[PDB]
Design a protein around this ligand. Structure first.
Ligand SMILES: *[C@@H]1O[C@H](CO)[C@@H](O)[C@H](O)[C@H]1NC(C)=O
Ligand SMILES: *[C@@H]1O[C@H](CO)[C@@H](O)[C@H](O)[C@H]1NC(C)=O
Ligand SMILES: *[C@@H]1O[C@H](CO)[C@@H](O)[C@H](O)[C@H]1NC(C)=O
Ligand SMILES: *[C@@H]1O[C@H](CO)[C@@H](O)[C@H](O)[C@H]1NC(C)=O
Ligand SMILES: N[C@]1(C(=O)O)C[C@@H]2CC[C@H]1C2
Lengths: 469, 454, 220, 217
């Protein structure tokens, strides 16, 4: 239904149509070269990516400390081959680490009968130790070993001839690195003479072996200045401390203890922890435990928990047991010495089922901290969001941005966030997706109006929100 | 003036392996695993979709050597179901299937090609749309200048992507040499694993659009099918094996671009090669689809369903220039879509329903008109198995998604207005006929095109 | 001692802004946040917002967001509430209040309130007219004396008798508003021995136009 | 926000008696974690600032008489006064402090009941200074009566006057629990000139006959 070959060539071969056809050909082809130049302009004018920082394993989420292998298990099973069994739990916690409270052969207060190299036979054999350590490698749980020498005694470095004790450690670190451990914790460095110098030597020995091993020192200190002094000469030492411990016991000081410390250290890496050893519940009253798990999982740095923090274990709740090493409550059998005292909700089995439980919050947060590039190594901006609220935004370059809102005071807010004076790079949205709340009865997943939000007393929120160029 | 036959066996295999291998094995390995839950079932739906494709494709070799028209599914439907069914089939492919699938693999080309300028952030949306359009435009122009260009381009990039997939499989083999199934099993969910997997096999039917352009159809159509789809199935299960040796389930479920993570892990400072080859793999498919899509519309115009200009050919080059220019422009309209990857559900529904109808037709025509020649005949079981399988996949996915499938049927039924107006009811004021003719000859004058002869 | 105090009265032409101010004393000013509460007549207390003097952060009720603006001046222990876009229905008393605990809202210490009137009518100093009984005055043992206050504006005028010395047996009647000017009267009763023998004055005083007047109650 | 209904809006009671305010909150103000109830009571005497009485539902503030006992939990709260004194007439507001911003009750006006008493009535001829203005205001004071209900007739050369009369009652006096009332009649000077004898007469429920005072200019 048109011109034949004959009819077309008798018309469309005219010089006017030839010039028109040439024009349309070159118009199209310069149009495509124009659209290429347009795209090459956009690709140069576009904001370049921000260099992603090379991160050691301990940046990627929580360590986990096991101060007594016996207390973590119940007796008889209290040995390293027992512990090899439990790693599936730890893998459930998404803990990127472990720290086995000292296993070396220490005789109480005896400098000479103590060895930091031979393991105390109660816990097994080096053949067990390696069996564990190899299993943990297989399951992506690095293992640190705690080498604080006189750990069965009163003073953990002994009272005397400290240079011989330092010499024991200097030898020990080499041996156990050769055995394959992922680094070392030492404790009580306030009871060690010339502490900063020995940390410098031991740190050099560790990093000198491999770049992906760490030394966690730990102090009973809560003085900002003493802490900053141990951290002056040593720059990639985690130093766990009592510094966040003195919280005011309705959280009231925390916005300030946290943001001073970040400011003072110059936003280096940190280890957030309420102590060098004892549980969260040694310090926090139980209305805050949820609120601190939301915070320890989302400040810049590697959080550290003792065992059973994830279930809000408490030494006082099952009377008589020592505040050093309370028996871990796996199921209702786990403390048979006063049977029927353990409620279901106090135990791992009893929490594991319930989305509202503490361990269901720990598990969930541990996920976010270990996957999300924003919590993994984002920047941090505190801001004044509200009267009680410790509030801050974690952000990376262009990834998802996370606003954390902790209501530390005992009075609910009824009038929204009202952020004064946000950094211009990090401005709050009109709305943001509630990724979780510390409290039940919230529409998790849904977007919230920040100017008309309502926190309850001690309700923390984790909101997630997308980028804007 | 009519199109010269010049597709060899090798260029036909390059059309199928080139047009299938495509994007699916780079952009969708996550998609099956999110529905299948575990490597044990995920790596199985990759084989299962292979099998369903193989029996469907062989079924297309029977149907194709039977009828031997070009225009594939549409042609074979017209010979069985008649005018209105065949028009609705083609109206769905004119509006949504072949435009959207072209724009989908073009966006993937642009995204993965630009990704080494933007590692660890979103690649700039507007530059990824431009470079998607630059791809479609250049391959339309190549496809208009010479079929001996566009088939050599198909060979070139069919080779390139198999080299890239060889590297990925090889690094898998290296890793497992150096040195399980927690599954959300639900008939209401595994179906969306299959619908995700089958998108990566989409294209076995594409050589059936160029049967009137191969040099020896009765040999090379059924040979190119059965050489091709076993190669594709093998490459796909070995490539998935490679991904699952390198990555955890949680990585593959949460990462944006599986092949990039695989590249990063194995190649470090040299990792940019894997993104670029995923790009070049998509580019090959844009070509293969522009090739086979333009020929569909050319046939639909020849056999009276589609306005006459699209049947015409540029006589100095023998390329179907108004059809290519249409399928091109119709592709670029998909740039005005935000969440375009949504359309893969509509694509998956609409495509296998049309293949179902075609193979119902294969049995029906072999019973109803048994005198027609069968240069290859295979079995009566493979059609029946494929029909009950595809009708299961359709019925069950419909049952799980009535809200989406309902609006889907309005796309189908949107054809009846245009069908009656253009084909059958034919409102015909003589000024309208004068206008359509005047517009047609104007298009002839611009593009210098002549209608098809004998 | 803890003591907040405030200006007594403000007049505002509708639509204009106003500054109301509250000077603390008797405590470390930055340790405690400062709150502003309002009392619309016969309609119950309403809280506007509070401010932290330590950094000028402030938090506001939904009704006041953008309508109010709190600031503070640590050099003088003063807190200030700006209010804006005032209508007639924002006429009220505005009270400055301090917390017990650091920001928690229950209010042991309040400043005496600032009465904010929103009206176009002009400031008008009072006219004072003393009242004495006239006929048969001394026929009774106790005698009443009075002080009309007429045609004044705005609302807050104060009367005390003999500079607050006669603080026993004084009645001052609430003001009546007429043709956009107020009228008020005050009364006192004294022994019949006292009044012709001694000074008696209504010490009328008006915060919003600074006039202080001591009319003596002289017999006819 | 929380909403606090309060009732009754008035609570007239006699000196020495026990009295009860009710406060009723649209949510619970028990803090589960701590087992105390966040509520306060403020007294506001007429012409003064709010004074805090009790908070956390029961804890008396320093400088508070021990006759204020606060109690309740959940949402039903009551402030009680063991033995009302004359000094206690006031508005009482309840306030939540379970959230910031806080919110308050619309408040209960406590009133005192006493033995009824007839007004001392006095009338004051216009001020000789006021007569310069072209106007004059005649004033009648009714002092120290109970209860509040009263009415006033103005007579002018015997004619009853009902244009240009104004009245103001005081709040009840905290020393003696009596009301007082001022009545005012405003005239032009020429309106005060043309008439000779001015009368204020007051009817109060303590007397069948009105009380009368008058003057002749
Ligand atoms: C400690 O290690 C640093 C390199 O990290 C090196 O410069 C220094 O000399 C070392 N010192 C000792 C005593 O090992
Ligand atoms: C920390 O150790 C020092 C030195 O033995 C001791 O004086 C101090 O009281 C300790 N503090 C705590 C709270 O353990
Ligand atoms: C702490 O933060 C303040 C914020 O104004 C800053 O000026 C100061 O330099 C920071 N560092 C120290 C050590 O005070
Ligand atoms: C657990 O349940 C017991 C028994 O109902 C209850 O008394 C207790 O408050 C609950 N919480 C914890 C952590 O003990
Ligand atoms: N084979 C495809 C692929 O990329 O995998 C699927 C769609 C049809 C042609 C392309 C797009």
């Amino acid at each position: 239904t048109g011109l034949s070959k004959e009819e077309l060539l008798k018309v469309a071969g005219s010089p006017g149509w030839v010039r028109t056809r040439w024009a349309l050909l070159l118009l199209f082809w310069l149009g495509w070269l124009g659209m290429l130049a347009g795209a090459v302009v956009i690709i140069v004018r576009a904001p370049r990516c921000r260099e992603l920082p090379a991160q050691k394993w301990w940046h990627t989420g929580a360590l986990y400390r096991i101060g007594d292998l016996q207390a973590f298990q119940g007796h008889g099973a209290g040995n390293l081959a027992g512990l090899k069994g439990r790693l599936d739990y730890l893998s459930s916690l998404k803990v990127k680490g472990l720290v086995l409270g000292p296993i070396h052969k220490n005789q109480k207060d005896d400098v000479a009968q103590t060895d930091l190299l031979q393991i105390d036979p109660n816990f097994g054999s080096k053949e067990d130790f390696d069996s564990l350590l190899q299993s943990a490698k297989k399951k992506s749980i690095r293992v640190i070993l705690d080498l604080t020498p006189n750990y069965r005694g009163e003073n953990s470095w002994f009272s005397t001839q400290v240079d011989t004790v330092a010499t024991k450690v200097k030898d020990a670190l080499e041996f156990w690195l050769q055995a394959g451990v992922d680094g070392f914790q030492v404790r009580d460095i306030e009871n060690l003479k010339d502490a900063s110098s020995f940390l410098a030597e031991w740190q050099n020995i560790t990093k000198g072996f491999s770049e992906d091993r760490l030394l966690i020192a730990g102090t009973n200190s809560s003085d900002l200045q003493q802490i900053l002094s141990l951290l002056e000469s040593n720059k990639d030492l985690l130093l766990t401390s009592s510094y966040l411990s003195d919280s005011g016991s309705t959280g009231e000081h925390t916005k300030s203890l946290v943001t001073q410390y970040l400011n003072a250290t110059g936003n280096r890496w940190c280890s957030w922890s309420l102590s060098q050893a004892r549980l969260l519940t040694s310090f926090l009253p139980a209305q805050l435990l949820r609120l601190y798990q939301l915070m320890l999982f989302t400040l810049p740095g590697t959080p550290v928990f003792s065992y059973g923090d994830e279930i809000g274990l408490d030494a006082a709740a099952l009377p008589g047991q020592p505040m050093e090493a309370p028996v871990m409550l796996w199921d209702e059998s786990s403390f048979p010495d006063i049977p029927g005292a353990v409620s279901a909700n106090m135990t791992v089995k009893g929490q594991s089922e319930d989305p509202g439980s503490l361990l269901s919050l720990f598990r969930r947060l541990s996920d976010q901290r270990s996957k999300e590039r924003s919590l993994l190594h984002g920047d941090f901006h505190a801001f004044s969001a509200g009267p009680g609220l410790f509030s801050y935004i974690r952000h990376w370059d262009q990834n998802e941005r996370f606003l954390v809102v902790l209501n530390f005071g005992d009075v609910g807010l009824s009038a929204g966030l009202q952020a004064s004076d946000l950094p211009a790079s990090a401005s709050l949205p009109a709305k943001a997706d509630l990724l979780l709340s510390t409290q039940p009865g919230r529409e998790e997943g849904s977007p919230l109006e920040l100017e008309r939000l309502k926190l309850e007393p001690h309700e923390g929120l984790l909101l997630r929100f997308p980028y804007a160029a | 003036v009519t199109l010269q036959r010049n597709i060899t066996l090798l260029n036909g295999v390059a059309i199928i392996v080139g047009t299938i291998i495509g994007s699916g094995i780079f952009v969708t390995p996550t998609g099956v695993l999110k529905e299948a839950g575990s490597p044990g079932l995920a790596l199985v739906v990759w084989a299962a979709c292979g099998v369903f494709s193989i029996v469907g494709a062989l079924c297309y070799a029977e149907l194709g050597t039977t009828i031997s028209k070009s225009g594939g599914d549409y042609a074979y439907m017209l010979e069985v179901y008649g005018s209105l069914p065949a028009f609705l089939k083609l109206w769905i492919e004119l509006l949504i299937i072949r435009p959207s699938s072209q724009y989908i693999v073009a966006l993937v080309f642009a995204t993965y090609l630009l990704k080494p300028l933007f590692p660890t952030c979103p690649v700039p949306e507007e530059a990824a749309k431009l470079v998607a359009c630059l791809c479609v435009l250049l391959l339309t122009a190549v496809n208009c200048y010479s079929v001996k260009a566009a088939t050599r381009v198909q060979d070139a990039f069919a080779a390139a992507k198999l080299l890239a997939l060889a590297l990925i499989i090889l690094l898998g083999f290296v890793q497992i040499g150096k040195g399980f199934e927690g599954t959300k099993l639900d008939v209401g969910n595994i179906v969306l694993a299959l619908y995700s997997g089958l998108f990566a096999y989409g294209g076995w039917n594409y050589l059936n659009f160029v049967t009137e352009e191969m040099i020896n159809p009765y040999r090379n159509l059924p040979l190119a099918i059965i050489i091709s789809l076993p190669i594709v199935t093998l490459v796909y299960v070995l490539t998935n094996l490679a991904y699952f040796t390198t990555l955890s389930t949680e990585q593959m479920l949460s990462s944006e671009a599986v092949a990039v993570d695989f590249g990063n892990y194995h190649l470090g400072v040299m990792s940019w090669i894997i993104p670029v080859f995923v790009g070049l793999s998509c580019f090959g498919s844009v070509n293969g689809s522009l090739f086979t899509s333009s020929r569909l519309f050319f046939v639909g115009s020849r056999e009276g369903h589609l306005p006459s200009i699209l049947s015409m050919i540029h006589p100095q080059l023998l390329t179907p220039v108004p059809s290519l220019v249409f399928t091109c422009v119709m592709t670029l309209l998909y740039a005005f879509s935000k969440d375009i990857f949504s359309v893969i559900n509509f694509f998956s529904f609409f495509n296998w329903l049309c293949v179902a109808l075609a193979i119902i037709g294969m049995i029906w025509l072999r019973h109803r008109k048994p005198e027609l020649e069968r240069p290859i005949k295979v079995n009566l079981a493979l059609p029946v198995f494929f029909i009950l399988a595809c009708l299961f996949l359709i019925a069950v996915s419909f049952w799980k998604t009535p809200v989406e499938c309902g609006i889907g049927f309005t796309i189908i039924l949107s054809g009846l207005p245009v069908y009656f107006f253009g084909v059958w009811w034919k409102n015909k004021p003589k000024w309208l006929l004068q206008g359509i003719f005047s517009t047609t000859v104007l298009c002839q004058k611009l593009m210098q095109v002549v209608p098809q002869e004998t | 001692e803890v003591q907040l105090q405030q200006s007594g009265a403000e007049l505002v032409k509708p639509g204009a802004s106003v500054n109301l101010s509250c000077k603390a004393s008797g405590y470390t000013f930055t340790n405690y946040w400062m709150h502003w509460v309002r009392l619309r007549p016969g309609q119950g207390l309403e809280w506007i917002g509070e401010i932290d003097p330590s950094d000028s952060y402030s938090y506001y009720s939904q009704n006041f967001k953008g309508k109010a603006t709190l600031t503070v001046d640590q050099s003088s222990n003063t807190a200030y509430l700006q209010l804006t876009s005032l209508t007639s229905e924002d006429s009220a008393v505005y009270y400055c209040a301090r917390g017990r605990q650091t920001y928690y809202p229950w209010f042991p210490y309040w400043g005496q309130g600032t009465l904010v009137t929103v009206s176009a009518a002009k400031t008008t100093p009072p006219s004072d007219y003393p009242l004495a009984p006239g006929s048969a005055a001394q026929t009774n043992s106790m005698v009443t004396l009075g002080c009309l206050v007429k045609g004044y504006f705005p609302e807050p005028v104060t009367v005390t008798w003999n500079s607050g010395s006669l603080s026993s047996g004084v009645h001052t009647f609430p003001a009546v508003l007429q043709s956009d000017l107020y009228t008020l009267s005050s009364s006192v009763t004294v022994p019949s021995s006292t009044w012709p023998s001694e000074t008696v004055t209504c010490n009328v005083a008006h915060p919003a136009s600074s006039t202080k007047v001591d009319k003596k109650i002289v017999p006819r | 926000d929380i909403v606090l209904t309060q009732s009754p809006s008035s609570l007239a009671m006699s000196v020495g008696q026990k009295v009860t305010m009710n406060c009723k909150s649209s949510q619970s103000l028990l803090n589960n974690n701590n087992q105390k109830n966040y509520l306060a009571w403020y007294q506001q005497k007429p012409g003064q600032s709010p004074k805090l009485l009790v908070y956390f539902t029961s804890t008396r503030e320093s400088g508070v008489p021990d006759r204020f006992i606060g109690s309740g939990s959940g949402t039903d709260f009551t402030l009680t006064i063991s033995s009302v004194q004359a000094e206690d007439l006031a508005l009482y507001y309840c306030q939540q402090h379970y959230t910031i911003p806080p919110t308050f009750g619309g408040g209960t006006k406590l009133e005192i009941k006493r033995a009824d008493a007839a007004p001392t009535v006095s009338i004051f001829p216009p001020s000789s200074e006021q007569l310069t203005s072209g106007g004059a205001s005649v004033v009648c004071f009714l002092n120290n009566f109970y209860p509040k209900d009263i009415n006033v007739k103005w007579k002018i050369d015997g004619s009853e006057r009902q244009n240009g009369v104004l009245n103001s009652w005081t709040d009840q006096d905290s020393k003696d629990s009596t009301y007082s009332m001022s009545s005012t009649l405003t005239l032009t000077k020429d309106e005060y000139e043309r008439h000779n004898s001015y009368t204020c007469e007051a009817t109060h429920k303590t007397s069948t006959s009105p009380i009368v005072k008058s003057f002749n200019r």
